[PDB]
Amino acid sequence: EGCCSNPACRTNHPEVCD
């Protein structure tokens, strides 16, 4: 996926990766 690594794109919206 595309935001599940950089912890800051993840924590913004995480359901689009985890």
Side-chain angles (χ1 to χ4, degrees):
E1 285 77 1
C3 282
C4 272
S5 57
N6 288 290
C9 178
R10 197 178 152 258
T11 204
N12 196 251
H13 90 123
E15 188 64 57
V16 200
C17 69
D18 295 299

PDB file of all heavy atoms in Angstrom:
ATOM      1  N   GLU A   1       0.832  -1.224   0.000  1.00  0.00           N
ATOM      2  CA  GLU A   1       0.000   0.000   0.000  1.00  0.00           C
ATOM      3  C   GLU A   1       0.838   1.232   0.000  1.00  0.00           C
ATOM      4  O   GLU A   1       2.051   1.147  -0.191  1.00  0.00           O
ATOM      5  CB  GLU A   1      -0.940  -0.058   1.214  1.00  0.00           C
ATOM      6  CG  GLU A   1      -2.119  -1.025   1.086  1.00  0.00           C
ATOM      7  CD  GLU A   1      -1.774  -2.492   1.287  1.00  0.00           C
ATOM      8  OE1 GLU A   1      -0.586  -2.821   1.554  1.00  0.00           O
ATOM      9  OE2 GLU A   1      -2.682  -3.356   1.161  1.00  0.00           O
ATOM     10  N   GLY A   2       0.264   2.430   0.214  1.00  0.00           N
ATOM     11  CA  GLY A   2       1.012   3.634   0.021  1.00  0.00           C
ATOM     12  C   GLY A   2       1.159   4.507   1.217  1.00  0.00           C
ATOM     13  O   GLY A   2       2.004   5.400   1.152  1.00  0.00           O
ATOM     14  N   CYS A   3       0.416   4.379   2.332  1.00  0.00           N
ATOM     15  CA  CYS A   3       0.720   5.235   3.435  1.00  0.00           C
ATOM     16  C   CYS A   3       1.071   4.491   4.678  1.00  0.00           C
ATOM     17  O   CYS A   3       1.359   5.087   5.714  1.00  0.00           O
ATOM     18  CB  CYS A   3      -0.330   6.293   3.814  1.00  0.00           C
ATOM     19  SG  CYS A   3      -0.238   7.700   2.671  1.00  0.00           S
ATOM     20  N   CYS A   4       1.065   3.146   4.658  1.00  0.00           N
ATOM     21  CA  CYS A   4       1.367   2.354   5.809  1.00  0.00           C
ATOM     22  C   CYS A   4       2.832   2.112   5.924  1.00  0.00           C
ATOM     23  O   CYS A   4       3.309   1.002   5.690  1.00  0.00           O
ATOM     24  CB  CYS A   4       0.621   1.012   5.911  1.00  0.00           C
ATOM     25  SG  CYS A   4      -0.992   1.100   6.743  1.00  0.00           S
ATOM     26  N   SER A   5       3.613   3.143   6.290  1.00  0.00           N
ATOM     27  CA  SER A   5       5.015   3.037   6.552  1.00  0.00           C
ATOM     28  C   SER A   5       5.546   4.303   7.132  1.00  0.00           C
ATOM     29  O   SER A   5       6.162   4.312   8.197  1.00  0.00           O
ATOM     30  CB  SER A   5       5.891   2.628   5.356  1.00  0.00           C
ATOM     31  OG  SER A   5       5.754   3.494   4.237  1.00  0.00           O
ATOM     32  N   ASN A   6       5.310   5.445   6.464  1.00  0.00           N
ATOM     33  CA  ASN A   6       5.554   6.761   6.969  1.00  0.00           C
ATOM     34  C   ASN A   6       4.579   7.060   8.056  1.00  0.00           C
ATOM     35  O   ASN A   6       3.406   7.120   7.689  1.00  0.00           O
ATOM     36  CB  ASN A   6       5.398   7.839   5.884  1.00  0.00           C
ATOM     37  CG  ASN A   6       6.586   7.714   4.940  1.00  0.00           C
ATOM     38  OD1 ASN A   6       7.716   8.023   5.311  1.00  0.00           O
ATOM     39  ND2 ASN A   6       6.342   7.256   3.683  1.00  0.00           N
ATOM     40  N   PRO A   7       4.831   7.230   9.320  1.00  0.00           N
ATOM     41  CA  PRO A   7       3.806   7.099  10.313  1.00  0.00           C
ATOM     42  C   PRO A   7       2.798   8.197  10.354  1.00  0.00           C
ATOM     43  O   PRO A   7       1.863   8.150  11.150  1.00  0.00           O
ATOM     44  CB  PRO A   7       4.535   7.010  11.651  1.00  0.00           C
ATOM     45  CG  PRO A   7       5.899   7.665  11.376  1.00  0.00           C
ATOM     46  CD  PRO A   7       6.149   7.197   9.934  1.00  0.00           C
ATOM     47  N   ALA A   8       2.941   9.229   9.500  1.00  0.00           N
ATOM     48  CA  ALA A   8       2.230  10.468   9.549  1.00  0.00           C
ATOM     49  C   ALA A   8       1.178  10.571   8.497  1.00  0.00           C
ATOM     50  O   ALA A   8       0.145  11.194   8.733  1.00  0.00           O
ATOM     51  CB  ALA A   8       3.200  11.661   9.497  1.00  0.00           C
ATOM     52  N   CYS A   9       1.333   9.924   7.329  1.00  0.00           N
ATOM     53  CA  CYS A   9       0.260   9.798   6.392  1.00  0.00           C
ATOM     54  C   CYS A   9      -0.698   8.785   6.920  1.00  0.00           C
ATOM     55  O   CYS A   9      -1.914   8.920   6.785  1.00  0.00           O
ATOM     56  CB  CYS A   9       0.652   9.501   4.935  1.00  0.00           C
ATOM     57  SG  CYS A   9      -0.765   9.287   3.819  1.00  0.00           S
ATOM     58  N   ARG A  10      -0.180   7.746   7.601  1.00  0.00           N
ATOM     59  CA  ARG A  10      -0.939   6.677   8.171  1.00  0.00           C
ATOM     60  C   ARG A  10      -1.899   7.187   9.191  1.00  0.00           C
ATOM     61  O   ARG A  10      -3.110   7.036   9.046  1.00  0.00           O
ATOM     62  CB  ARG A  10      -0.056   5.638   8.880  1.00  0.00           C
ATOM     63  CG  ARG A  10      -0.819   4.329   9.102  1.00  0.00           C
ATOM     64  CD  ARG A  10      -0.013   3.210   9.763  1.00  0.00           C
ATOM     65  NE  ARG A  10      -0.991   2.353  10.489  1.00  0.00           N
ATOM     66  CZ  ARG A  10      -1.204   2.390  11.838  1.00  0.00           C
ATOM     67  NH1 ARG A  10      -0.417   3.095  12.702  1.00  0.00           N
ATOM     68  NH2 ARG A  10      -2.281   1.704  12.320  1.00  0.00           N
ATOM     69  N   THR A  11      -1.415   7.878  10.240  1.00  0.00           N
ATOM     70  CA  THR A  11      -2.158   8.351  11.366  1.00  0.00           C
ATOM     71  C   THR A  11      -3.192   9.384  11.069  1.00  0.00           C
ATOM     72  O   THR A  11      -3.988   9.796  11.910  1.00  0.00           O
ATOM     73  CB  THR A  11      -1.237   8.899  12.416  1.00  0.00           C
ATOM     74  OG1 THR A  11      -1.810   8.881  13.716  1.00  0.00           O
ATOM     75  CG2 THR A  11      -0.745  10.330  12.140  1.00  0.00           C
ATOM     76  N   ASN A  12      -3.233   9.821   9.798  1.00  0.00           N
ATOM     77  CA  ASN A  12      -4.143  10.822   9.331  1.00  0.00           C
ATOM     78  C   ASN A  12      -5.401  10.157   8.892  1.00  0.00           C
ATOM     79  O   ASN A  12      -6.457  10.786   8.858  1.00  0.00           O
ATOM     80  CB  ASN A  12      -3.555  11.696   8.211  1.00  0.00           C
ATOM     81  CG  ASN A  12      -4.358  12.971   7.995  1.00  0.00           C
ATOM     82  OD1 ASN A  12      -5.046  13.141   6.991  1.00  0.00           O
ATOM     83  ND2 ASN A  12      -4.243  13.931   8.953  1.00  0.00           N
ATOM     84  N   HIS A  13      -5.355   8.872   8.495  1.00  0.00           N
ATOM     85  CA  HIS A  13      -6.385   8.320   7.671  1.00  0.00           C
ATOM     86  C   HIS A  13      -6.235   6.844   7.552  1.00  0.00           C
ATOM     87  O   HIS A  13      -6.313   6.341   6.432  1.00  0.00           O
ATOM     88  CB  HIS A  13      -6.298   9.067   6.328  1.00  0.00           C
ATOM     89  CG  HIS A  13      -5.397   8.491   5.278  1.00  0.00           C
ATOM     90  ND1 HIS A  13      -5.967   8.200   4.067  1.00  0.00           N
ATOM     91  CD2 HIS A  13      -4.169   7.902   5.300  1.00  0.00           C
ATOM     92  CE1 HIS A  13      -5.142   7.412   3.403  1.00  0.00           C
ATOM     93  NE2 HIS A  13      -4.043   7.230   4.113  1.00  0.00           N
ATOM     94  N   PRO A  14      -5.995   6.031   8.538  1.00  0.00           N
ATOM     95  CA  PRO A  14      -5.231   4.838   8.312  1.00  0.00           C
ATOM     96  C   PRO A  14      -5.959   3.716   7.653  1.00  0.00           C
ATOM     97  O   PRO A  14      -5.318   2.740   7.268  1.00  0.00           O
ATOM     98  CB  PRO A  14      -4.812   4.388   9.710  1.00  0.00           C
ATOM     99  CG  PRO A  14      -5.920   4.937  10.624  1.00  0.00           C
ATOM    100  CD  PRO A  14      -6.223   6.285   9.952  1.00  0.00           C
ATOM    101  N   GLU A  15      -7.291   3.788   7.487  1.00  0.00           N
ATOM    102  CA  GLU A  15      -8.110   2.730   6.984  1.00  0.00           C
ATOM    103  C   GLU A  15      -7.909   2.494   5.527  1.00  0.00           C
ATOM    104  O   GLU A  15      -8.283   1.460   4.973  1.00  0.00           O
ATOM    105  CB  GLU A  15      -9.594   2.937   7.327  1.00  0.00           C
ATOM    106  CG  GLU A  15     -10.558   1.790   7.011  1.00  0.00           C
ATOM    107  CD  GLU A  15     -10.285   0.525   7.814  1.00  0.00           C
ATOM    108  OE1 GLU A  15     -10.282   0.573   9.073  1.00  0.00           O
ATOM    109  OE2 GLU A  15     -10.079  -0.556   7.201  1.00  0.00           O
ATOM    110  N   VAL A  16      -7.210   3.403   4.824  1.00  0.00           N
ATOM    111  CA  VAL A  16      -6.875   3.272   3.440  1.00  0.00           C
ATOM    112  C   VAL A  16      -5.593   2.534   3.258  1.00  0.00           C
ATOM    113  O   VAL A  16      -5.084   2.374   2.149  1.00  0.00           O
ATOM    114  CB  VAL A  16      -6.867   4.610   2.766  1.00  0.00           C
ATOM    115  CG1 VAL A  16      -7.005   4.490   1.238  1.00  0.00           C
ATOM    116  CG2 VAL A  16      -8.033   5.474   3.271  1.00  0.00           C
ATOM    117  N   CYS A  17      -5.003   1.984   4.333  1.00  0.00           N
ATOM    118  CA  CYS A  17      -3.899   1.084   4.206  1.00  0.00           C
ATOM    119  C   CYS A  17      -3.954  -0.104   5.105  1.00  0.00           C
ATOM    120  O   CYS A  17      -3.841  -1.211   4.580  1.00  0.00           O
ATOM    121  CB  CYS A  17      -2.562   1.840   4.278  1.00  0.00           C
ATOM    122  SG  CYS A  17      -2.098   2.566   5.878  1.00  0.00           S
ATOM    123  N   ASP A  18      -4.093  -0.002   6.438  1.00  0.00           N
ATOM    124  CA  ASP A  18      -4.123  -1.146   7.296  1.00  0.00           C
ATOM    125  C   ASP A  18      -5.307  -2.067   7.033  1.00  0.00           C
ATOM    126  O   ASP A  18      -5.110  -3.283   6.771  1.00  0.00           O
ATOM    127  CB  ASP A  18      -4.299  -0.852   8.795  1.00  0.00           C
ATOM    128  CG  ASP A  18      -3.142  -0.082   9.420  1.00  0.00           C
ATOM    129  OD1 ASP A  18      -1.982  -0.574   9.419  1.00  0.00           O
ATOM    130  OD2 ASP A  18      -3.420   0.988  10.021  1.00  0.00           O
TER     131      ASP A  18
END
